[PDB]
Amino acid sequence: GSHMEAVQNRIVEAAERVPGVRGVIHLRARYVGQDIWAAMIIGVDPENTVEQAHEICEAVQAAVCGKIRRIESLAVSAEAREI
Amino acid sequence: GSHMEAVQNRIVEAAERVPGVRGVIHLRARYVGQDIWAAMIIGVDPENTVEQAHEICEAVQAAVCGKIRRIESLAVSAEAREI
């Protein structure tokens, strides 16, 4: 089941190129029919505001849903990640 | 099924008395055996930091699990709420 490993990779790469994302902490993805439904946690600067972290999450969603073909549901939340 | 409405009320009141919580936005609660498992979204100042919002969520968890008897699982996340 490695068509899923390929896709997870592209999702991770896609997300990380959005401003403010410091790593994908967590990504769950499953096939629903021919579609992918995913849920993601991104690391963000602990000192970003809550409203900034929301904006980053939305940009990640737009970027991934925009770029990655079979993704039809993506939930994105944020956690503090110091690096 | 109104032993659940009573408990949801006490959870909401409990959470709202934690510093930085501006309303409970969402609370899902279910009985697992004789226990309650719940998941909650609190409103917080959009200008709090991410790390502050984490701390508020943890204080809500400590407060609710500490005070409300049959709750054995509580997940708490934060969303921006301007008021």
Side-chain angles (χ1 to χ4, degrees):
Chain A
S2 60
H3 298 82
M4 204 70 253
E5 181 149 32
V7 168
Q8 283 189 64
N9 213 71
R10 257 42 173 307
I11 290 158
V12 170
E13 298 182 339
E16 286 184 330
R17 303 171 166 127
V18 174
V21 171
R22 302 181 158 184
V24 174
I25 289 167
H26 176 74
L27 171 58
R28 175 158 290 171
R30 280 273 61 252
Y31 285 101
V32 184
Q34 286 173 16
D35 288 346
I36 306 292
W37 290 15
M40 173 179 296
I41 307 170
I42 55 162
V44 295
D45 189 345
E47 303 183 50
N48 287 170
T49 65
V50 171
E51 203 79 271
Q52 284 166 339
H54 182 61
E55 291 165 342
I56 306 155
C57 290
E58 292 173 354
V60 165
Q61 265 196 312
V64 167
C65 297
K67 291 168 78 195
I68 313 206
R69 257 256 298 159
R70 309 170 85 182
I71 311 323
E72 295 297 344
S73 181
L74 180 63
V76 195
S77 62
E79 217 176 280
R81 175 105 95 80
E82 195 58 283
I83 349 165
Chain B
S2 60
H3 298 82
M4 204 70 253
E5 181 149 32
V7 168
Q8 283 189 64
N9 213 71
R10 257 42 173 307
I11 290 158
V12 170
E13 298 182 339
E16 286 184 330
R17 303 171 166 127
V18 174
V21 171
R22 302 181 158 184
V24 174
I25 289 167
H26 176 74
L27 171 58
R28 175 158 290 171
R30 280 273 61 252
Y31 285 101
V32 184
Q34 286 173 16
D35 288 346
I36 306 292
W37 290 15
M40 173 179 296
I41 307 170
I42 55 162
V44 295
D45 189 345
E47 303 183 50
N48 287 170
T49 65
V50 171
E51 203 79 271
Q52 284 166 339
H54 182 61
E55 291 165 342
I56 306 155
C57 290
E58 292 173 354
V60 165
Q61 265 196 312
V64 167
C65 297
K67 291 168 78 195
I68 313 206
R69 257 256 298 159
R70 309 170 85 182
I71 311 323
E72 295 297 344
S73 181
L74 180 63
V76 195
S77 62
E79 217 176 280
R81 175 105 95 80
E82 195 58 283
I83 349 165

